[PDB]
């Protein structure tokens, strides 16, 4: 019968296990930001843990997908495109990021799907997701951890996420430096290449090109030396 | 306390010190009223131990040797932190 | 159906197209039958005066619009048959390329029915081109290119390496040497979007074949286990030439793709270098 | 912290729980330092955070807290070190490197680490004011060798982004430090600063720089000095306007003192303030001061104070003197055009505003001259005239600069053509300001005059949108002027209704329409956003990437407005559309324009009729989900003008039928209905047909048809006069006055040849 304003007020009467297991499938098919925020407000008013519901949704989707080549670089057989589960993995992030409260688990799942993409060869999607997500993720994580006033039960998940994010950022910076260097090699190497000089305007254009090449070479060497250091 | 929870420059630190001085003056007036006649502990629902702990907390939050505003009262029936 | 269409056609246009056209399009895409209503087909014949054709004209344009609507919706074999009945080699080859382009990216081994569908579509297109006037010059060039590419793809997927190598050498379209990079770049400017997009998979298959050949050459002994040192040196020199031509092409073409593809390109370049 | 009974109980409980091992306290040192910082205790907080760092060096939160504590205390070097340690641990903040660079530059460091962090910040975050500030503070610590690099850097930054108030201020400061007053003056007089010369702080800084330059180089008479003086006077007038737009006697006195100081500084350098262009500049300053004094008087009279009925005469005399004195329209020496353009724009704006306000206060024509003449006569009249010319200056009156000089007030009235030209000139720099168009429409409706919407739209969009009546194939690029005129008329009518509903406690002696600076956005920002998007898509001032979605949204909005495939408007706004279309159509004498207007009318009515069928049963008003206007006055539930609405719908239907070739059904519906608009349109059509017939030959059948049409037109005018004399609702529902109708009836009767009083008399309309 649909009507999302009547499901949360009746799910709470069910046992917690079955209620969560069914709210998972209920929220798996939810679109539109207005309807999403309406369901969020309804769940918050009824007293349902929609955050853990979405976390269990993501966990069930990952368990059904059974990962992608585990966490090891496994090259596909012959010629093939992307995996069929990558679309769902990249689409489930919308409802996960729609609730900014569980930043720790959000970054944990982001690192998990990043390892899955690195194993299944998806550096482009990895770069797009990294550009979409901010860089102060671990910063906000430890800020929330120190603001929640609960340092007695401090595990190692924060440090693991810090190390994972640092390694991912380093690998992405290395890859971007490599492709920028290759594109600069494909382009003229900022050297005075003889292309035919026999007039005043020709020599003026050649001098201007040499000056621009020197400036571009200086900027390239500077930023590449910084990144490589 | 809500103000001190955030970063405070010179003006905010001086206003925090002024609020602490006002609270200390109120507590000193309460202590003087209690010492003038031993009936405050029986009149108020909380004993004099609560007022003593409040005065101790105020003296501890005032500092030790870096307060921008010097106090103008004497610690009665309490310890001296600042 | 025709009795109702005779009344539906009396209404003029109303907010784009016509209600009669929308109704007949919905009916034909829900029925999927035209061997007696629009025209029978032996294998690639023309159109026949059907029931609706014996009363209304503009049948060619009607069939073309119906096939275009079916292609925009998501129909392939029926739309191809309809265009073959309406006699339109340009549109036939266009839809053939549009349906074979996304399958090139994935595998081409006989595992489902998409490969059989593309094979029968290619056979129908080639027999239509043989019996009658084909498409334009660029369209026929792209058709031959895609035919050779899928041939090399299936030859590589079947497990053979020497066959793929000799067909990719006889194609006479990959960068051979430095003097050929110029004409390769000159011909690249007259390609198409699909010809520029499938280059990724083409280079991937080429680098896979080259790496397999290099691994076999390294496993084979220089002086023992066959393959004389002179043959090894000749193979190394031809690999040097192929890599230099390919890297010059990829460096002086006005088109860049992705970091992974670029890294693999340079990897094969230095492997053969 | 807080020490109470349960508080100290929980404290000692936690202390006993953490006393099982020193590692418990070592790991709870974070909360320990938190409670410390809550209760000050900087030394204890630092000790606890140092213990926490020694326990878990891989925790940037402790390092950040220690850096914050050091910055609060005063150890800037220790805070910089802690922030650098946190950054080396992990990039916890993008602005952290910028803050580190700024702090190290304040501490004056330039050996290795400082330059490295500055370069890292410049490579990470792009060109920004903070980046430029830290780079300048780093380069200023090296001396002249660093000063040259700072000059090169600021030159590169100015070449990159020339429109930057902070960059301009820093360049002015650098010029003042290097004693380059001429360079600072040139940078301030650069033509790229005319668009930025608007903020109060920037204008005051420019005024101070000009005054200092004049005091330093007093004693020279040059064209550059004259231009500097003119620009300083313009900036002084601007800051005086900005300070007197409010109601602050202290700000008024401060502005007067600033103007006096500027005049004293000018008299020390430039010999006087009257020359070739100096006289025109002084006249413009006097006119602007008079206009602003009149505007302030009107505002203080509208704001319901102690004097609002007798202050309308001094303001009128001040406006008359401001109109009599010359205004900046054509400078004799064309050289300072960069500022002359903005000066002419502001002059046109203030002239249009003052004219509209005076006409709205006088209700039609300036009838205050009769009262002025009747009041001014003897010695008391002369004294009152002098006091009105000198305005009022008591304890709360703000009119220090409003004192008129030696002159006399001449009787004059503004011109409608001049007002239209001023509006067209203002729209060019407004770029289609919806608030300005709304204020102009409100003033025109208060003055009871047809607003030049065609000229307004032609001046707003340089592409000149043509007039079309499309019904199929919605195209966003093929914009029609009819939809824009309909939207403008609807917005104007809604704002007029809102003003009439809000002016319940207002006096008639006060200006009905609010001035421009205080009447901004009388509706919903959605309409302004839609108008801005339409203007951008027309003038190609959007983005080619989002051009597709912009065109799609514009086409959807145009379809929703035309109401031919998607509907969801309001009956009130549809009635406003119909009324505006009728007022814009029946006021002129055209052919194809009237046909397109009637087509738009019937296209609106064909969807308004189902909406009107719901408001007749006293049900719910069909309001959309998106509030387009203020939902407090557009409630259609009263059965009052429903008969007139049905009559107008029948008129539109009959006109569409006559256009489609159904004259019989059209005349049948016209004779069945009883509305003055029907007979007016019939008379117009009959006159057009008679003219088109007389343009050719006149056979017997054509002559008989012309006589029958003239008789029908005479009868239609007679019944129009009867309906007008019946109930006064015709005077409101008729876009054409009865005087023109009676004149046309008399002309038709004279052309026919009749003169009796049995049908349409001579000197009266009815019988």
Curated annotation (Swiss-Prot), chain C:
It comes from Xenopus laevis. This is Nuclear pore complex protein Nup93. Belongs to the nucleoporin interacting component (NIC) family. Plays a role in the nuclear pore complex (NPC) assembly and/or maintenance. GO terms for biological process: nuclear pore complex assembly; poly(A)+ mRNA export from nucleus; protein import into nucleus. Keywords: Membrane, mRNA transport, Nuclear pore complex, Nucleus, Protein transport, Translocation, Transport. Its main location: nucleus. It is found in: Nucleus membrane; Nucleus, Nuclear pore complex. One of its GO terms (cellular component) is nuclear periphery. GO terms for molecular function: structural constituent of nuclear pore. The keyword Isomerase does not apply. The gene is nup93. The chain holds residues 548 to 820 of 820 of the full protein.
């Amino acid at each position: 019968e649909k009507q999302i304003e009547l499901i949360a007020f009746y799910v709470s009467h069910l046992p917690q296990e079955l209620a969560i297991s069914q709210y998972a499938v209920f929220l798996e098919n939810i679109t539109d930001p207005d309807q999403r925020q309406r369901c969020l407000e309804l769940a918050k008013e009824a007293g349902l843990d929609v955050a853990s519901i979405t976390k269990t949704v993501v966990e069930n989707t990952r368990k059904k997908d059974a990962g992608e080549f585990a966490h090891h670089d496994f090259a596909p057989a012959l010629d093939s495109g992307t995996s069929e589960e990558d679309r769902a993995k990249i689409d489930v992030i919308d409802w996960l990021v729609f609730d900014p409260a569980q930043r720790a688990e959000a970054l944990k799942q982001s690192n998990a799907i990043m390892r899955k993409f690195l194993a299944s060869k998806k550096h482009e999607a990895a770069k797009e997701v990294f550009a979409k997500i901010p860089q102060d993720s671990i910063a906000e994580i430890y800020s929330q951890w120190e603001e929640q006033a609960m340092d007695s039960a401090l595990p190692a998940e924060d440090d693991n996420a810090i190390r994972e994010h640092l390694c991912i950022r380093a690998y992405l910076e290395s890859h971007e430096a490599f492709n920028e260097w290759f594109k600069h090699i494909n382009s003229p190497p900022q050297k005075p290449t003889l292309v035919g000089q026999a007039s005043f305007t020709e020599k003026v254009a050649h001098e201007h090109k040499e000056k621009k090449y020197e400036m571009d070479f200086g900027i390239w060497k500077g930023h590449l030396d910084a990144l490589t250091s | 306390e809500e103000i001190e929870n955030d970063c405070l420059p010179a003006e905010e630190q001086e206003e925090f010190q002024e609020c602490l001085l006002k609270c200390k003056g109120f507590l000193k007036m309460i202590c003087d009223e209690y010492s003038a006649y031993p009936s405050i502990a029986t009149s108020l629902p909380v004993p004099v131990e609560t007022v003593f702990e409040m005065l101790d907390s105020v003296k501890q939050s005032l500092g030790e040797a870096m307060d921008d505003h010097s106090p103008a009262f004497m610690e009665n029936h309490s310890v001296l932190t600042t | 159906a025709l009795q109702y269409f005779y009344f539906l056609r009396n209404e003029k246009d109303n907010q784009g197209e016509s209600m009669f056209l929308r109704c007949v399009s919905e009916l034909v895409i829900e029925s999927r039958e035209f061997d007696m209503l629009l025209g029978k087909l032996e294998k690639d014949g023309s159109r026949k005066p059907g029931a609706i054709d014996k009363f209304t004209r503009d049948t060619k344009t009607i069939i073309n619009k119906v096939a275009s609507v079916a292609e925009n919706k998501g129909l392939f074999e029926e739309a191809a048959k309809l265009y073959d009945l309406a006699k339109n080699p340009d549109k036939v080859l266009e839809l053939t390329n549009k349906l074979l382009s996304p399958v090139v990216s994935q595998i081409s081994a006989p595992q489902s029915n998409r490969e059989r569908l593309k094979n029968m579509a290619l056979a129908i297109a080639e027999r239509y081109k043989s019996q009658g006037v084909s498409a334009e010059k660029s369209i026929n060039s792209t058709f031959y290119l895609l035919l050779d590419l899928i041939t090399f793809f299936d030859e590589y997927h079947a497990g053979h390496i020497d066959l793929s190598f000799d067909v990719i050498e006889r194609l006479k379209l990959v960068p051979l040497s430095q003097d050929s990079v110029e004409e390769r770049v000159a011909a690249f400017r007259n390609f198409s979007d699909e010809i520029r997009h499938n280059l990724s998979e083409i280079l991937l298959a080429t680098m896979n074949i080259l790496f397999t050949q290099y691994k076999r050459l390294k496993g084979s002994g220089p002086t023992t286990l066959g393959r004389p040192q002179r043959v090894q040196e000749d193979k190394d020199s031809v690999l040097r030439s192929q890599a230099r031509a390919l890297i010059t092409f990829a460096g002086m073409i006005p088109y860049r793709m992705s970091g992974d593809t670029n890294a693999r390109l340079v990897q094969m370049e230095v492997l053969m270098n | 912290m807080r020490r109470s009974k349960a508080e100290i109980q929980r404290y000692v409980e936690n202390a006993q729980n953490s006393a099982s091992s020193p590692r418990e306290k070592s790991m709870k040192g974070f909360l320990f330092a938190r409670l410390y910082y809550e209760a000050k205790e900087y030394e204890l907080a630092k000790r606890s955070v140092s213990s926490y760092i020694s326990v878990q060096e891989r925790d940037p939160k402790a390092h950040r807290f220690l850096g914050q504590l050091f910055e609060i205390e005063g150890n800037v070097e220790k805070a910089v070190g802690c922030y650098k340690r946190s950054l080396e641990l992990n990039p916890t903040q993008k602005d952290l490197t910028l803050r580190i660079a700024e702090l190290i530059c304040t501490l004056n460091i330039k050996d290795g680490r400082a330059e490295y962090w500055v370069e890292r910040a410049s490579k990470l975050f792009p060109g920004s004011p903070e980046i430029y500030r830290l780079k300048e503070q780093l380069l200023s610590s090296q001396g002249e060798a660093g000063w040259n690099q700072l000059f090169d850097l600021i030159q590169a930054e100015l070449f990159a982004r020339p429109n930057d108030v902070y960059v301009n201020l820093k360049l002015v400061d650098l010029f003042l430090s290097n004693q380059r007053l001429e360079e600072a003056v040139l940078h301030c007089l650069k033509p790229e600063r005319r668009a930025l010369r608007t903020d109060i702080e920037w204008c005051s800084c420019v005024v101070r720089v000009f005054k200092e330059y004049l005091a330093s180089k007093q004693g020279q008479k040059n064209t550059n000095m004259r231009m500097i003086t003119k620009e300083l006077l313009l900036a002084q007038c601007d800051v005086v306007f900005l300070t007197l737009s409010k109601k602050d006697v202290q700000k008024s006195k401060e502005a007067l003192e600033r103007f006096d100081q500027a005049l004293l500084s000018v008299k020390q350098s430039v010999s006087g303030t009257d020359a070739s262009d100096l006289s025109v500049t002084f006249y413009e300053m006097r006119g602007h001061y008079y206009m602003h004094a009149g505007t302030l008087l009107l505002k203080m009279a509208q704001s319901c104070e102690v004097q609002w009925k007798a202050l309308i005469e001094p303001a009128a005399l001040c406006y008359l003197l401001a109109y009599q004195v010359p205004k900046p329209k054509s400078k004799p020496v064309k050289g300072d055009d960069n500022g002359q353009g903005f000066l002419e724009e502001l002059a046109f704006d203030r002239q249009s505003k003052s004219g509209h306000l005076l006409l709205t206060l006088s209700h039609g024509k300036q009838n205050f001259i009769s009262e002025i003449i009747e009041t001014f006569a003897n010695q008391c009249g002369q004294s009152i005239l002098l006091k009105f010319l000198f305005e009022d200056n008591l304890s709360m009156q703000d009119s220090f600069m409003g004192s008129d000089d030696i002159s006399y007030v001449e009787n004059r009235v503004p011109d409608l053509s001049e007002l239209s030209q001023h509006d067209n000139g203002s729209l060019r720099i407004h770029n289609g300001d919806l608030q300005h168009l709304t204020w102009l429409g409100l003033q025109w409706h208060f003055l009871s005059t047809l607003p030049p919407l065609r000229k307004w739209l032609k001046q707003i969009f340089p592409r000149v949108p043509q007039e079309t009546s499309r019904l199929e194939s919605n195209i966003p690029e093929s914009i029609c002027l009819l939809d824009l005129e309909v939207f403008l008329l609807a917005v104007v009518q809604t704002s007029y209704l809102q003003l009439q509903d809000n002016n319940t406690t207002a006096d008639p002696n006060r200006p009905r329409c609010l001035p421009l600076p205080i009447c901004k956005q009388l509706f919903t920002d959605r309409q302004r956003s839609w108008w801005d998007a339409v203007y951008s898509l027309i003038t190609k001032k959007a983005l080619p990437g989002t051009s597709a979605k912009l065109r799609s949204v514009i086409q959807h909005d145009l379809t929703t407005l035309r109401a031919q495939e998607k509907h969801g408007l309001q009956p009130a706004v549809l009635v406003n559309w119909a009324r505006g279309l009728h007022k814009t159509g029946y006021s002129l004498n055209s052919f194809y324009d009237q046909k397109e207007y009637m087509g738009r009318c019937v296209h609106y009515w064909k969807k308004l009729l189902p909406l009107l069928d719901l408001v007749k049963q006293k049900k719910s008003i069909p309001e959309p989900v998106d509030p387009l206007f203020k939902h407090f006055h557009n409630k259609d539930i009263k059965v009052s003008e429903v008969k007139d609405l049905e009559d107008e719908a029948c008129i539109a239907f009959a006109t569409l039928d006559l256009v489609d070739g159904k004259t019989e059904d059209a005349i049948i519906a016209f004779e069945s209905v009883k509305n003055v608009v029907a007979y007016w349109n019939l008379a117009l059509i009959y006159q057009r047909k008679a003219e088109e017939i007389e343009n050719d030959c006149l056979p017997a059948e054509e002559q008989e048809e012309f006589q029958e049409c003239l008789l029908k037109c005479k009868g239609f005018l007679k019944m129009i006069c009867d309906e007008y004399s019946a109930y006064p609702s015709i005077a409101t529902s008729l876009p054409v006055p009865v005087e023109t109708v009676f004149e046309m009836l008399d002309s038709v009767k004279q052309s026919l040849g009749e003169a009796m009083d049995d049908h349409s008399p001579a000197f009266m309309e009815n019988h």
